[PDB]
Design a protein around this ligand. Structure first.
Ligand SMILES: C[C@H]1C(=O)N(C)C=Cc2cc(OCCCCCOc3ccc4c(c3)C=CN(C)C(=O)[C@@H]4C)ccc21
Length: 127
């Protein structure tokens, strides 16, 4: 019934590094998706209490959102760009699992996902 704590976005024990790929993920990928018209339901953790979804955290065991993804990227929480890419996939996949095809929320996740897959095709080469 209650919401779980938000996903961890900061750990001082984790090593930090900056890469051209992680910078692209926040400056290009995150910035493009955030401003999109369908982004609003994905900009923060699913609030199962305020949205009245009592079974959400019974179906979804790996919650994810762009707010958490952006906080992780600002805190230097990701070491590999693939960790961030998996997080975006998990957010899209959670939406498709909890909801049904043809739903307005699924059509919004599908458009964000198409915008995301185009950006990852142009992900610069490691340095
Ligand atoms: C599980 C959870 C979920 O998976 N996530 C990610 C988060 C939240 C969420 C949000 C959900 O619902 C949001 C509402 C549906 C999206 C907006 O779609 C429409 C459709 C029609 C209109 C408008 C918007 C706009 C203006 N008005 C007033 C209109 O009448 C027009 C015609 C459902 C599920 C989740």
């Amino acid at each position: 019934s209650m919401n779980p704590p938000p996903p961890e976005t900061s750990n001082p024990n984790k090593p930090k590094r900056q890469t051209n790929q992680l910078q692209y993920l926040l400056r290009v990928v995150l910035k493009t998706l955030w401003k999109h018209q369908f982004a609003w339901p994905f900009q923060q953790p699913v609030d199962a209490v305020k949205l009245n979804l009592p079974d959400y955290y019974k179906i979804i065991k790996t919650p994810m959102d762009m707010g958490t993804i952006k906080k992780r990227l600002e805190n230097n929480y990701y070491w590999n760009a693939q960790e961030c890419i998996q997080d975006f996939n998990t957010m899209f996949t959670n939406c498709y699992i909890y909801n049904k095809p043809g739903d307005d929320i699924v059509l919004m996740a599908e458009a964000l996902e198409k915008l995301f897959l185009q950006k990852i095709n142009e992900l610069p080469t490691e340095e």
